[PDB]
Amino acid sequence: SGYTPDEKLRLQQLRELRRRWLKDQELSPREPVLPP
Amino acid sequence: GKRLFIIKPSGFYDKRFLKLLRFYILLTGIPVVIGITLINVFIGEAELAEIPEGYVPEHWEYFKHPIS
Structure with missing residues (x-):
C-alpha cells in the first residue's frame, strides 16, 4: 500500500512545527538560571 | 546544547508554605x-x-x- 499524499503533506507540516518547537525547548541565554 | 529546559510544576507555593510552616512553628x-x-x-x-x-x-x- 503506502501513504496517501494528504498524509505526506500533513506529516511534513508537523515535521516543521515539531522541529521548531523542540529546537525552541532548549534554554540557552548562556545565563539560564539566576538567583533573584 | 547538551542541556535542555526541564519542566516541573510550580514549586513556589510548595516552598512558601513549607517556609511559613517551619517559621511559624519555630517562632x-x-x-x-x-x-x-x-x-x-x-x-x-x-x-x-x-x-x-x-x-x-x-x-x-x-x-x-516545677512547671507541673
Whole structure:
C-alpha cells in the first residue's frame, strides 16, 4: 500500500512545527538560571 | 546544547508554605524549649521528703516537675 499524499503533506507540516518547537525547548541565554 | 529546559510544576507555593510552616512553628518552639531547659537546669525538680509533724501541704507540693 503506502501513504496517501494528504498524509505526506500533513506529516511534513508537523515535521516543521515539531522541529521548531523542540529546537525552541532548549534554554540557552548562556545565563539560564539566576538567583533573584 | 547538551542541556535542555526541564519542566516541573510550580514549586513556589510548595516552598512558601513549607517556609511559613517551619517559621511559624519555630517562632515559639525555640523560646519554649529554652524556657523549659532553663527551668529544669536552674530551678530544681524536688526532693522526696516525708510530711513533717504537725504540718499540712497544699494541693501543689505533691508534684515532681516545677512547671507541673
